[PDB]
Amino acid sequence: QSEAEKARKELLELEALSMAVESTGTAKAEAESRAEAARIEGEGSVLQAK
Amino acid sequence: LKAQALAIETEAELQRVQKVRELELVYARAQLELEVSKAQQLAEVEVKK
């Protein structure tokens, strides 16, 4: 069980990196899509106002 | 971007309100002139009577 925990530590490190990658990719994608839609709506609102 | 659209609609609205209030001022001045002419002519015929 000691040897198994010695390797399980490195397994948990790699799983931590993968969870980091997945979470930041999901949040970045959703936030940038909302910002792009908002920018297009803002320039459209400028043209509507004129 | 909201600031830019606010600037456009504000400039248009203020030009409109300026023109409206200017002509309203001129017409209220003309109503004042007709009113004071009425008041002084009726006062004069009352005084003469």
Report yes or no: A46 and B9 within 8 Å, Cβ to Cβ. no
> Which residue on chain B is closest to A43 by alpha carbon?
B1
Rounded Cα gap, residues A32 and B48, in angstroms: 87
Element spanning B49, H or E: none
Rounded Cα gap, residues A15 and A40, in angstroms: 38
Q: Whose structure tokens read 């002084």?
A: B40
CB pairs under 8 A between A and B: 19
| The two three-digit tokens of residue B43, written as one number | 């006062």
| The two three-digit tokens of residue A42, written as one number | 């803002």
| The two three-digit tokens of residue A20, written as one number | 């980091």
A10 touches chain B (CB under 8 A): no
On chain A, the residues whose CB falls within 8 A of the CB of B8 are 46, 49-50
Per DSSP (E only), the strands in chain B are none
The three-state DSSP-derived secondary structure of chain A is CHHHHHHHHHHHHHHHHHHHHHHHHHHHHHHHHHHHHHHHHHHHHHHHHC
